[PDB]
């Protein structure tokens, strides 16, 4: 007959932070999943406003984390959707850090990851103030680069600009491939979300969307990598002979050289410049024309020279990025040529190559294996003419793969989309999986896909064994000691901000936040690009 | 069994537990875990640089 609700209760303020309560230290989005992992016996938990008011009472459920071989307790507070600042209080354990629930919760993190790219620029001075700390360096590598290894002549050809790759300052075409392709696909996949975004970059007042300004800085370097002979072959990297010391980049005066071509670098150049051509055309159509003409020169080379060719890196001991095969790279090039230009020849090249992939979509992918990028662009194209059976084969594999990633994250004690798989750079892959999930969601809308993408993000922001953000400058107890030369050489205690560290391996507890650990604690453009894609989907996003 | 030199440390192959192949940003490497006074260490060497004995362990692990 009669129902009236009990008064809201407030918490006693004796709750202390406990490192066993592991959650996304940035926060959550209304109408999406919200979970914490509690590595301690518990039952009841409360979600508490910053003022002490209890808004939710739940029961944590036990789960075995096969990765760390521990029983953990999962607190699901997904039903809390009101925007605000909260913490989780776990009687008998303690409390979590404070977190936010907001539709725009990830926008600052997106902007900071973008700042990391800005701060990796080569050939120019860079300067930014981040949380009151001034990070800067003077113009570096302004004498890029010499041709001695290309044609024997000690001739300089401009190869400035672009991004420093990692914790070293050298610039590698093959790693640029996945980086630029993943960032360009963030642009295409989330264009209405990213087009209005203003960034803290020097290009903030020109007529180009700021996300694309950052990418142009890299394409400007990429464009310099074709051989001067006009063959269309693409130099593998611009590099010093050996890895330099932990010095600021403007203090590195050793000569830098173009390194002999690879077929994969050539294919990656085609894909990047073909994408650049269609993406830049509305804003800098002269540059777009330059990009497509360059793409065509190199694609003609690849058509006439089908063999896989590894770069001759004799004389160098810096990064190799020697992808084992160019078949994926050539598939991606054909897809992008087709998407930009539409010619039947490109479509036929792509479809013939795609048919030779037994598994059309791979869950675990990175610079060495870029075929997913082509599959995504082909599947999502609005162009007519696609073979229906190939389309269906790619769709089936995409959805099967996405469903498997959801199953992995759902059955992992920390929602890790990559499961028990650890290797050098795996943190990058955790977030790169959001590409498969978001593309799956475009083809077959499914909340599980979007929530799994948020599980990948949550994992790198503190819902993990270590209870730490893996991104410099963000979240709970971020990495302080990346293998990063600017960080090591400047006079600042905190490292340069916005970088996703590579991750521990072979095991789930093997990450070490120490500068000597290039194996686990470096930074990289391909890792940031994956994080950028992951966060991009949640910029100017409304989940109602 | 022979000594594996890696960046400069030396590990007898008799101490190596798991061996596997990885294409890293630095090039193709043979990675491995090993016994270090009762802890488990991790190391890696260029594939082109690995002794026959380590490459045999890799082949077995891969078969
Ligand atoms: Ca702009
Ligand atoms: Ca490849
Ligand atoms: Ca520092
Ligand atoms: Zn530089």
Residue numbers in the entry:
A (entry chain A): 34 to 577
B (entry chain B): 1 to 7, 12 to 67
Would you copy out the relevant sentences from the publication that reported this structure?
As an important step towards this goal, we have exploited the plasticity and stability of artificial 7 kDa affinity proteins (Affitins) derived from extremophilic proteins, such as DNA-binding protein 7d (Sac7d), which are found in various Archaea such as Sulfolobus, Acidianus, and Metallospharea genera. As a proof of concept that Affitins may inhibit different glycosidases specifically, we used these libraries (L3 and L4) and those we had previously designed without an extended loop (L1 and L2) to select Affitins specific for the inverting endo-glycosidase CelD from Clostridium thermocellum (EC 3.2.1.4). We also analyzed an Affitin specific for the well-studied (retaining endo-glycosidase) HEWL (EC 3.2.1.17) previously selected from the library L1.
E12 and H3 Affitins, which are derived from libraries with a longer and randomized loop 2, present a protruding convex region that penetrates the catalytic cleft of CelD, thereby validating our strategy to use an extended randomized loop. Additionally, the loop presented a charged residue that interacted via salt-bridges with those involved in the catalytic reaction. However, some contacts were different from those observed for the CelD-E12 complex. The motif Leu-Thr/Ser-Lys inside the extended loop was conserved, except in Affitin H3, where Leu was changed to Asn and Lys to Arg, although the latter implies a conservation of positive charge at this position.
